[PDB]
Structure 1
Amino acid sequence: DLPKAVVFLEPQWYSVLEKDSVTLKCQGAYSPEDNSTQWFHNESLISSQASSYFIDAATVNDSGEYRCQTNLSTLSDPVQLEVHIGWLLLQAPRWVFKEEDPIHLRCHSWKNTALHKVTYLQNGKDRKYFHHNSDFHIPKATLKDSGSYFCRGLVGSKNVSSETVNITITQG
């Protein structure tokens, strides 16, 4: 036989800031009495028996591997997730992009505060700059592009930046 749960995060970003919020839904096959889902933190049962685990205020304690499983369903492959502390974080889905892919860099801000003259950088070099905050796309990445990114901007008078990150341009 072949069931097998599944986990989906929404919003799509698997990396986030505290007080940031996310929900992990568990797509599975329920069965009589067992209209219940179990949530695993790393490899451990945790309360919330919902069908969608919901994190209002996030926090690092919250970081980890979330897998789920229902009755008639197998055990969800892992979906890793992480909460980082800061005024902003660099979002992206994967970090290992094939020569020519849909790069989506998001300079996100703590408690979604507002961001001024924002910048996406790398290796230390100011790549792209926006006045009011904006996501940063690149149709198809390029190998020349590989490097270590981060962004920075303005929270009122305050100035801020993200923890660096490694984008890896592969040859396929």
Structure 2
Amino acid sequence: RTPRPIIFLQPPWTTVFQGERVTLTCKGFRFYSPQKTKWYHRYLGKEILRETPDNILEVQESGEYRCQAQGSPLSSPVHLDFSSASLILQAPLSVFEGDSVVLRCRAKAEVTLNNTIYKNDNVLAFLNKRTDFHIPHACLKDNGAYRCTGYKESCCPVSSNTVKIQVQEPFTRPVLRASSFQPISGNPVTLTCETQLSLERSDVPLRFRFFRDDQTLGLGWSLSPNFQITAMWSKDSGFYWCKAATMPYSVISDSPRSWIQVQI
């Protein structure tokens, strides 16, 4: 349905300066492509094709980029931006939960005074002699249009570009499937905590913890998304659910509690 390769910025700032260069990596985990990537660069009524024998594409021009792996559809647009302006707000291309978003209020080789990050056209934070804004844990509250403003030496208070920080879920909210929600007593019923991991974050393993009504099952977390119960009796017929977590246990999503009944 969605075999779209993802382009990864390096540095992750989608907006950079004129002399700087960024490397665009057409990362394909499933349906991998170490080479032969057809880049559909487009700036202004352009369909420029620049094929490279590697997975990287070092560029220094603005526009909208995408890559096309072998046997794979076109990639999502990447709105690169190279600015000659005196102040820009560098933001990561993709923001996921649990990330450390660093919205840099970086000027063009100048120490801009009185920086102030505006979220949704109102003051959010103040950076006195500082540039790097920091969100320690990105969530849905950290959505909107950010834009930093700062006084120059004596020329002009300069407003930077607007970057839309949209936070996407690293994995879909888990749903606890089971082999049967009404297992006869003495039958093995396998729990399943499926989470459709986003293709941006697919190399990160997931740890699943399966629960009874309020008592955890097994020994903490486990990389296996299937918790097999050899034989469940009538006692343990309660609200079963699961918790899907990333490898640092930073962002944890709780599955809806599906009731499992035991038939006898």
TM range (shorter): 0.5 to 0.7
The 2-side partners of 1:96 and 1:26 are apart by 18
The match for 2:12 is 12
Matched, 1:55 2:59: yes
Out of 137, 140, 157, the position equivalent to 2:154 is 157
1:136 alignment partner, SS class:
coil
C-alpha deviation, 1:155, in angstroms: 3.6
| CA deviation vs aligned residue, 1:31-75 (integer Å, no higher than 9, x gap) | xxxxx543221594523635332224x3xxx311321436xx745
Go from structure 1 to structure 2 and tell me whether the alpha carbon gap of 1:8 and 1:94 turns closer, same or farther (over 3 Å shift): closer
Give matches, 1:28-67, under 5 Å: 28-30=33-35, 36-42=36-42, 44=47, 46-47=49-50, 49=52, 51=54, 52-56=56-60, 58=61, 62-67=62-67
The 2-side partners of 1:5 and 1:142 are apart by 25
The 2-side partners of 1:168 and 1:24 are apart by 20
1:133 alignment partner, SS class:
coil
The match for 1:89 is 88
Go from structure 1 to structure 2 and tell me whether the alpha carbon gap of 1:157 and 1:103 turns closer, same or farther (over 3 Å shift): same
C-alpha deviation, 1:25, in angstroms: 3.0
The 2-side partners of 1:129 and 1:169 are apart by 22
The 2-side partners of 1:49 and 1:65 are apart by 14
The match for 1:33 is none
Matched residues, number: 157
Task: Tell me which amino acid in the other structure corresponds to 1:47.
Answer: R
Task: Tell me which amino acid in the other structure corresponds to 1:133.
Answer: R
The 2-side partners of 1:5 and 1:96 are apart by 17
C-alpha deviation, 1:136, in angstroms: 1.0
Instruction: Note the aligned Cα RMSD (angstroms).
Output: 3.9
Relative contact order higher in (CA < 8 Å, ≥ 6 apart): 1
C-alpha deviation, 1:167, in angstroms: 4.5
On the 8 A contact 2:13/2:93 being kept in 1, the answer is no
The 2-side partners of 1:44 and 1:12 are apart by 24
Matched, 1:117 2:114: yes
C-alpha deviation, 1:88, in angstroms: 2.2
1:16 alignment partner, SS class:
strand
C-alpha deviation, 1:130, in angstroms: 2.2
Specify the structure having the higher radius of gyration (Cα): 2
Gaps of 5+ in 2: 28-32, 174-264
Larger deviation, residues 40-49 vs 148-157: 40-49
| CA deviation vs aligned residue, 1:104-132 (integer Å, no higher than 9, x gap) | 3221334x443222111234433322232
C-alpha deviation, 1:12, in angstroms: 0.9
Out of 127, 134, 137, the position equivalent to 1:140 is 137
Sequence identity of aligned pairs in percent? 29
On the 8 A contact 2:101/2:134 being kept in 1, the answer is yes
Go from structure 1 to structure 2 and tell me whether the alpha carbon gap of 1:48 and 1:133 turns closer, same or farther (over 3 Å shift): farther
C-alpha deviation, 1:102, in angstroms: 4.0
Gaps of 5+ in 1: 31-35
